[PDB]
């Protein structure tokens, strides 16, 4: 319970009330491989979308709960959406975290899964952490309760405990949707406009390939890939469930820091949720010929479609087979600032 009293006196500037929680290792293992993170709070609104300041959450892992039943990581969620009096709760209201060590993996949590279980679980001197002395005397089992998670179907333990007035006001609060409805529709909107840009670039040209990346191709390429076999190019737009892991936003976050290339690569047909948001590097002493080795290793991928984004506002789609279709990236810069505030600072 070390992180509980570690960000309860630090996050009190940006947030009135702080919640203490657990994440099991089993539920967040598909967020990040090999438990590489060791956070950033950004609660987005359901009907009142906007943008909010980012709050920092101190989390430390590898340390168990008081229960021996499950052993997982520690976390905390700030609650600061409730304007003025926090007696109102916003229902169907997400809270999004950016847990990280070196930014990797994302977590989304409803306020309703949080708050329903929070009521369910119930000549100087040196300065003393009065919260630390008050935390130490509870030390019991029923402070922690297991609550199912609506995003990912697992039990997420919250630890609340009759500590002080700050949690004391918390369980007395009650009040009388569309928060994940927007982010899917937004990403599919920009994916539809990108596929329309590729449609008009294939239309103003002949229906042909320019083949930016060289790779050798067999004679049976029109057989083993059928005539107008755009099955992957059909279903590409359904396969992009994520955006903030995608390389599509990696160009927009890298405009201010200069310009490299980013790759969203997907399986020809359901071979696995492959890869999102990687780098093609010209900075290190691998150099431009080292980046060209990566790009020909990209074009030689015979079982994956590829999408390329540049940081300067251009988008490409590399077919398996070295073929490519040029395209444009440009969008209304309100959504640029929207994504830039969704990730971090403007």
């Amino acid at each position: 319970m070390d992180v509980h009293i570690d960000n309860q006196v630090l996050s009190g500037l940006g947030t009135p009330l702080l919640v203490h929680l657990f994440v099991p290792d089993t539920v967040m293992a598909e967020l990040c491989p090999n438990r590489v993170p060791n956070a950033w709070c950004q609660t987005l609104f359901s009907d009142r979308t906007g943008l909010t300041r980012v709050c920092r959450v101190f989390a430390a892992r590898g340390m168990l709960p008081g229960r021996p039943s499950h052993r997982g990581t520690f976390t905390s969620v700030p609650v600061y959406c409730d304007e003025g009096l926090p007696e109102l709760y916003n229902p169907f209201h997400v809270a999004a975290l950016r847990f990280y060590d070196e930014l990797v993996g994302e977590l989304q949590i409803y306020y309703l899964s949080l708050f329903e279980g929070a009521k369910r679980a119930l000549l100087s001197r040196v300065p003393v952490s009065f919260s630390k002395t008050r935390r130490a005397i509870r030390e019991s089992r029923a402070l922690v309760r297991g609550i199912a998670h609506i995003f990912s179907p697992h039990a997420l333990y919250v630890v609340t405990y009759p500590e002080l007035s700050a949690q004391g006001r918390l369980h007395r609060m009650t009040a009388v949707l569309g928060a994940p409805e927007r982010e899917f529709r937004f990403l599919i909107s920009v994916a539809l406009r990108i596929s329309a840009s590729f449609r008009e670039k294939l239309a103003m040209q002949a229906w042909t390939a320019q083949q930016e990346i060289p790779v050798v191709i067999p004679t049976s390429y029109s057989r083993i890939y059928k005539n107008s076999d755009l099955i992957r190019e059909a279903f590409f737009t359904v396969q992009t469930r994520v955006s903030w892991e995608s390389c599509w936003v990696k160009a927009t976050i890298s405009n201010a820091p200069d310009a490299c290339l980013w790759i969203d690569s997907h399986p020809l047909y359901e071979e696995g949720a492959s890869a999102w948001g990687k780098v093609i590097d010209s900075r290190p002493p691998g150099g431009l010929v080292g980046a060209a080795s990566q790009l020909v290793a990209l074009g030689t991928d015979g079982h994956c479609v590829h999408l390329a984004t540049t940081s300067d506002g251009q988008a490409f789609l590399v077919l398996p087979g070295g073929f490519v279709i040029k395209g444009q990236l440009a969008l209304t810069p309100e959504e640029r600032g929207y994504i830039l505030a969704r990730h971090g600072i403007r």
Binding site: S195, T237, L319
Partner: protein, 68 residues
């Protein structure tokens, strides 16, 4: 022997005018199905997280039962 077309930048794809305009429409048809299936399982866990609230409120009202 097996013959492989050498990479030149005049190597064209097999010409595809009719490929994509039905493809994006059937893609969005599958996409809406994916989205409302995910919204259905979201609403199922959402009704299961709200249902224990009214039962906890009823078990809180069962306190006043014990003194009557």
């Amino acid at each position: 022997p097996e013959l492989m077309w050498a990479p030149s930048l005049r190597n064209s794809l097999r010409v595809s005018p009719e490929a994509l305009e039905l493809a994006e429409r059937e893609a969005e048809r599958a996409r809406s199905e994916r989205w409302d299936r995910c919204a259905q399982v979201l609403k199922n866990r959402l009704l299961r997280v709200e249902l224990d609230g009214i039962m906890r409120d009823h078990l809180a009202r069962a306190e006043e039962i014990r003194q009557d």
